[PDB]
């Protein structure tokens, strides 16, 4: 349903924004792994959570 997809997308962005604010929840070692392809740190963590 379009409602479920919209709800999931908005909630996911709120989590990512809060997680990466101030001191990030995820260490720099995991960011290096998730940014090997070329995607940014925020984007790499976002796909893994999904």
């Amino acid at each position: 349903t379009s409602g479920s997809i919209i709800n999931h997308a908005n909630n996911l962005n709120k989590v990512i924004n809060h997680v990466f604010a101030d001191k990030p929840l995820i260490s720099e070692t995991m960011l290096k792994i998730l940014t090997i392809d070329g995607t940014t740190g925020k984007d790499g963590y976002r796909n893994w959570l999904d």
Binding site: N10, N11, K14, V15, H18, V19, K23, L25
Partner: protein, 51 residues
Amino acid sequence: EDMAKIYGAVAAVSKNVNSSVTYEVKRGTHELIKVPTIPHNLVLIQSDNGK
């Protein structure tokens, strides 16, 4: 510290719930003007001698 971040993220999701909507119902409504005089459109024609 990392627990406060996880707990903060969950509270952000729970706070995203919508309460209600508010709007004005004005469609179909028009203002009213006031006409002060009644048009009669009458004239009295009388001869000079009054006959």
